[PDB]
Amino acid sequence: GDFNLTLLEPVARSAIEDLLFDKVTIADPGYMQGYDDCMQQ
Amino acid sequence: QQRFVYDAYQNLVGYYSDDGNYYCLRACVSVPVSVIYDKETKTHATLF
Amino acid sequence: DQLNSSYFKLSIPTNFSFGVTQEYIQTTIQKVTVDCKQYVCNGFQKCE
């Protein structure tokens, strides 16, 4: 209602949840094809 | 002018040759292997 | 200040504010499996 929960609402991750991941620096896990990306790519 | 190039890890990541075509050296990466086995089935699934 | 009387002094706020306290709890760690044969011996039989 009057209280705004849009930040906590799923966009699915929520906006604050996505923002925290973006702010933190994390190397791409590449679980599906990471070994291939390191080689030819 | 210098020949083989090394990273901070000291792994050989680069090489220089008389031809002048630069070659990046990457060690033969191993392919990860894991076994998914169920005793009741007595069968296994290879995992990469 | 405490009062030497039946009446007692009370300190009570006439204004209110809302603030958010942020806390992080680490419930998981990265899971790592090491291939001992490649890492320890670099694929060399004499080391094995």
Q: How far, in Å, CA of A31 to CA of B7, rounded?
A: 25
What Å resolution does this PDB entry report?
2.5
* A40 close to A33: Cβ distance less than 8 angstroms: no
| Contact criterion met (CB < 8 Å) for B34 and C33 | yes
Q: How far, in Å, CA of B25 to CA of B5, rounded?
A: 9
Q: How far, in Å, CA of B7 to CA of B14, rounded?
A: 8
Segments in A1-41 forming alpha helices (H): 15-23, 34-39
The reply to whether A35 touches chain B by the CB within 8 Å rule is yes
Interface of B with C (CB under 8 A): 30, 32, 34
* B37 close to B44: Cβ distance less than 8 angstroms: yes
